[PDB]
């Protein structure tokens, strides 16, 4: 009967993970942040797509504004709505409406406009849309360790990259011999990370694979 003491002590460790993973859900179930990184990544592509002409279009201020049809597009995604926060907070509720129309117009423009890049209808959006949550979680994960690893002395994990690397690596089922929690605590939450990152990162590659069958 002594084992119940030793065996139940394990249950505790096995228990935390139940939350670390449960919490990971409450961080990817937001129809928002998910749908916001997507519309911010598609534009970063334009941030180097159209705003990357030689040092002769990068000097003519007149020509960037000249394309008043792109300026609104190459602005943010939600960093327009982000502002809406510092507005509604200042009771400028009147101005809120106008900015709401701007996001409405922007989603119709980009949404439909982008969908004009033929050869894939409704097949290419389900992708990124999904790629979102998938990545978000990994982030959350890397952040998890980040907190419990950055401060540690001799801990191979330092920058958000190094902690981010470990995330992808352990979530892509890859894992090397460079990124690994020093404090058993990191190793702990890690069990959760991968328990999550994997399952998700897999649903990702699942469609990546299928789609790849073209």
């Amino acid at each position: 009967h002594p084992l119940v003491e030793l065996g139940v002590s394990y249950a505790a460790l096995l228990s935390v993970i139940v939350v670390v993973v449960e919490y990971t859900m409450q961080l990817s179930g937001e129809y928002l942040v998910r749908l916001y990184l997507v519309d911010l990544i598609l534009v970063i592509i334009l941030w180097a797509d159209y705003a990357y002409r030689a040092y002769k279009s990068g000097d003519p201020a007149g020509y960037v504004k000249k394309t008043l049809y792109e300026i609104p597009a190459l602005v943010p995604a939600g960093l327009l709505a982000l502002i809406e926060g510092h507005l509604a907070g200042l009771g400028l509720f009147r101005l809120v409406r106008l900015l709401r129309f701007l996001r409405i117009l922007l989603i119709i423009s980009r949404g439909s406009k982008f969908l004009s890049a033929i050869a894939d209808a409704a097949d290419k959006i389900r992708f990124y849309h999904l790629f979102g949550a998938v990545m978000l979680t990994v982030l959350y994960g890397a952040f998890a360790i980040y907190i419990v690893e950055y401060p540690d002395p001799n801990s191979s994990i330092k920058s958000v990259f190094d902690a981010l690397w470990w995330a992808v690596v352990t979530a892509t089922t890859v894992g090397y011999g460079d990124v690994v929690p020093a404090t058993p605590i990191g190793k702990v939450i890690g069990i959760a990370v991968m328990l999550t990152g994997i399952s998700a990162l897999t649903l990702l590659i699942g469609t990546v694979s299928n789609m790849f069958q073209k």
Partner: antibody, heavy 116, light 105 residues
Framework: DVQLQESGPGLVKPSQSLSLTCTVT?????????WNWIRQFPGNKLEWMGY???????SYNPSLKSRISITRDTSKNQFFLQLNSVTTEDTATYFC???????????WGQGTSVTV | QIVLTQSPAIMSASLGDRVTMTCTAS???????LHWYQQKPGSSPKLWIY???NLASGVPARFSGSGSGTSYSLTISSMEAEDAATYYC????????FGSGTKLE
């Protein structure tokens, strides 16, 4: 033609949480403006507790925060006031109001008396 | 955060006289976020003067508001049997607050 319709208990024992319910008609809690919970003490004074808004986000009175929170019934069109550990000081009247432009409750509910 | 002082806390006068009130904020404000509410004891509060210089829909033109920086007023021109109400003035700088109420008798 809008109109807030407040209702609620009105008597509880200390350390017990207060749960208020205010309905809204002729409008929506998601369109625009903010939604407040400003009480009126026995001293006829007025103390603003907090607010949820058209979007959802909320903010409270810097003092009460440590002991309160608020929500809403997105579907039925109502918001909820929640105060934890109601002492004697909390004895007062309660009101829910439409926070119009630059913050200015432009529509007040009739009222409810809460005793502690 | 800041505090409000609605003097007189209580005051009188009668039909005809240009009634006056004053909201003295311990600290500066913002001509916008300054509003006046009228409350008839027993009933429910009712916004009366918004954004310093413009009034509510169901308000008689007899009213007028004057303020800036640290002080604002709710001046009138003539009272009635109705005006007998507790007028409040709230502001919004750091957070939200209200006043003692320039009670009318």
């Amino acid at each position: 033609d809008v109109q807030l319709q407040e209702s609620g208990p009105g008597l509880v024992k200390p350390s017990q949480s207060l749960s208020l319910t205010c309905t809204v008609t002729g409008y929506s809690i998601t369109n625009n403006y903010a939604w407040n919970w400003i009480r009126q003490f026995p001293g006829n004074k007025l103390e603003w507790m907090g607010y949820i808004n058209y979007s959802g986000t909320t903010s409270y009175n810097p003092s009460l925060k440590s002991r309160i929170s608020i929500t809403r019934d997105t579907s039925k069109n109502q918001f909820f006031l929640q105060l934890n550990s109601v002492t004697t000081e909390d004895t007062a009247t309660y009101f829910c109001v439409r926070g119009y432009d630059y913050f200015a409750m432009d529509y007040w509910g009739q009222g409810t008396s809460v005793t502690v | 955060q800041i505090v409000l002082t609605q003097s007189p806390a209580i005051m009188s006068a009668s039909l005809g006289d240009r009634v006056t009130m004053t909201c003295t904020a311990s600290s500066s404000v913002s001509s916008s976020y300054l509003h006046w509410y009228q409350q008839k004891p027993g009933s429910s509060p009712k916004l009366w003067i918004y954004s310093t210089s413009n009034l509510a829909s169901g308000v008689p033109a007899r009213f007028s508001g004057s303020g800036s920086g640290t002080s604002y007023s709710l001046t009138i021109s003539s009272m009635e049997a109705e005006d007998a109400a507790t007028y409040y003035c709230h502001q919004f700088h750091r957070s939200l607050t209200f006043g003692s109420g320039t009670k009318l008798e």
